[PDB]
């Protein structure tokens, strides 16, 4: 139904803040609510011959009201002026993942930190947002804790990779709407090999290149006329769109894909250049999920 | 398991060390060693034409000289007479459902961590990664800088235990790869697989020594099955993929599952499973039912 509007899953974590900071301006943008969500199991999760204490799982509750509350104060921060119309606040008693997932049926973005607070030097993406980019039943928008959020009006543009599949029509969709409504300009960018194609000999790609960058032209012309106050940019490049999306996140405020694209396979959750981009990528990055 | 251990080859780094680990196990098991290189060759683009024939003959001509290669790694790394049986394959098609189709007859699927298209950033590529999430068999994960060719090697095998069904398994090989290749194990057990660093009133000590005390239990039978080889076990108190990467600098091999107790219904990879394989130091086998 989408009456919960925009999600944002909160921890003790940097990015979850930020992510916080984002998600209170788009409801706001959009006019829709905004809720609050913070997870706590409470399920047994030690052998049984070694059971936890009985003060431990309402220091939890207390450690989540006192994060909720902190991240209501945030809420009040981002907001230019209205702030969204309803602003709501849960603490659920179940795992990250599976309540969150469950909650996304009836939501219109999903918002959660790229790295949470069980995060190391190592790691790139955190299990909740890992899962949430696999299994949710809306778009997903990560956010890393030294993306830009705070600044307004923003003039940088909207980045997006299309590939022509369905999944990709969706993350076109979100691009040129979210585009629109913050009033910038939009940069659809298309590799025409999903393949790197570095060694392959006999390509003059100079010649290649002036005849794809005619039917993407094509392929957005009804979005272009849909959308007439937004000037597009269209941009195509020979192959490794993963890797030209995250070097050009850095000239935009926000990067859209889809959640698939052409290639994959049978049970892929995400795909390579969704999770890559989600995972390296400068900015907020939406990946759109059907 | 009439394909033996499977290696997937591609031009890299990681891909040749790959090969030499798997060459050794194949060897020290006495089944079949089977390299496969996949070309997909067809590449769907939005003016629907197909590939000059030229670069068709090409790609053909570049697996034969990798394969070329890895025939030759595998009687570099061959200790004594080395794996009973040596194949290699070309498929004309995508290297995930490939090898995960391929896996359904191998008793291991070896491959590197990082392949050609790595770039700085990125942990795992999309073939490791797909085949931890769908292979039918354990996937061993090689990183370009893991000690292999170094023999004897004497350092123990590390191996997370967690209790569950997948746990099980994992314990298992690492019982059999210690035992196999002579030398000891090291299970670990973390206590909490949430971070329980400002947890108030525990008690550490008390609950260390019962869990000391039934992870003792548990590889009890193991111990018997396997009266060669010196168990050691490590209790720590959570954080069980950091506690195991840190850990494997001292060991030859890191064995974990590719689920626990954890985890929600359609997860393909634990979050510990997958970590470790992408920041051990050393190779990590992630078991798979
Ligand atoms: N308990 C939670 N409830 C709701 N959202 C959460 C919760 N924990 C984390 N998140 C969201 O997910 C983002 C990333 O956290 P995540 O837990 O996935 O990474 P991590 O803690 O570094 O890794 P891991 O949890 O696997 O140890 C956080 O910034 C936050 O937005
Ligand atoms: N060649 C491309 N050019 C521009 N954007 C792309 C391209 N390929 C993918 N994308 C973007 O990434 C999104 C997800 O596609 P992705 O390629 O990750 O899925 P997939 O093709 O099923 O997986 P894989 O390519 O790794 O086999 C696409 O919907 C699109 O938004
Ligand atoms: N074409 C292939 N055929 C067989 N095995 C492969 C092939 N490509 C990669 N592999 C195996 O997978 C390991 C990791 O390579 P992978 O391709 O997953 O990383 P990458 O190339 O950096 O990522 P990506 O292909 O998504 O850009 C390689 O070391 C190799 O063992
Ligand atoms: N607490 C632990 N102590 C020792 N080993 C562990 C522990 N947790 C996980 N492992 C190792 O990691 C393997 C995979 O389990 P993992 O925890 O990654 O899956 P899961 O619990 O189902 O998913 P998740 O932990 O993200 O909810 C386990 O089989 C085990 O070998
Ligand atoms: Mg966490
Ligand atoms: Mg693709
Ligand atoms: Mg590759
Ligand atoms: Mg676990």
Redesign the interface.
């Known amino acids: 139904n989408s009456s919960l509007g925009i999600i944002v899953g909160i921890d003790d974590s940097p990015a979850a803040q930020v992510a916080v900071r984002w998600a209170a301006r788009d409801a706001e943008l959009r006019k829709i609510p905004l809720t609050l969500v913070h997870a706590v199991?409470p399920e047994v999760?030690?052998?049984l011959?070694?059971p936890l204490?009985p003060?431990?799982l309402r220091?939890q509750q207390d450690?989540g009201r006192h994060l909720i509350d902190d991240a209501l104060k945030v809420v009040e921060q981002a907001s230019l002026r209205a702030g969204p119309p309803t602003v709501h606040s849960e603490i659920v008693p179940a795992?990250a993942?599976?309540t969150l997932?469950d909650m996304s049926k009836d939501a219109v973005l999903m918002v959660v930190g790229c790295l949470g607070?069980?995060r190391?030097p190592?790691?790139?993406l955190?299990?909740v947002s890992?899962?949430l980019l696999?299994?949710a039943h809306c778009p997903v928008v990560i956010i890393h804790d030294e993306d830009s959020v705070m600044p307004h009006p923003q003039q940088a543009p909207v980045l997006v990779g299309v590939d022509?599949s369905s999944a990709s029509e969706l993350a076109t969709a979100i691009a040129f709407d979210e585009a629109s409504r913050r009033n910038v300009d939009l940069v659809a960018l298309?590799a025409?090999?999903?393949?790197?194609?570095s060694?392959?000999?006999?390509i003059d790609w100079p010649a290649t290149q002036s005849?794809?960058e005619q039917?993407l032209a094509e392929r957005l012309a009804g979005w272009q006329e849909r959308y007439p106050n937004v000037a597009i940019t269209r941009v195509v490049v020979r192959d490794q769109p993963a890797?030209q999306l995250v070097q050009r996140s850095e000239e935009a405020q926000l990067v859209v894909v889809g959640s698939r694209g052409?290639?994959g396979?049978?049970?892929?959750?995400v795909g390579?250049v969704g999770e890559?981009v989600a995972?390296?990528a400068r900015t907020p990055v939406i990946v759109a999920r059907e």
């Open positions: 199991s999760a030690t052998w011959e070694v204490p003060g431990v220091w450690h795992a993942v599976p997932v607070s069980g190391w190592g790691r790139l955190g299990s890992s899962g696999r299994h022509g298309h025409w090999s999903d393949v790197d194609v060694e392959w000999p006999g005849m794809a039917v890797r052409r290639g396979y049978a049970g892929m959750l390579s890559t995972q390296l």
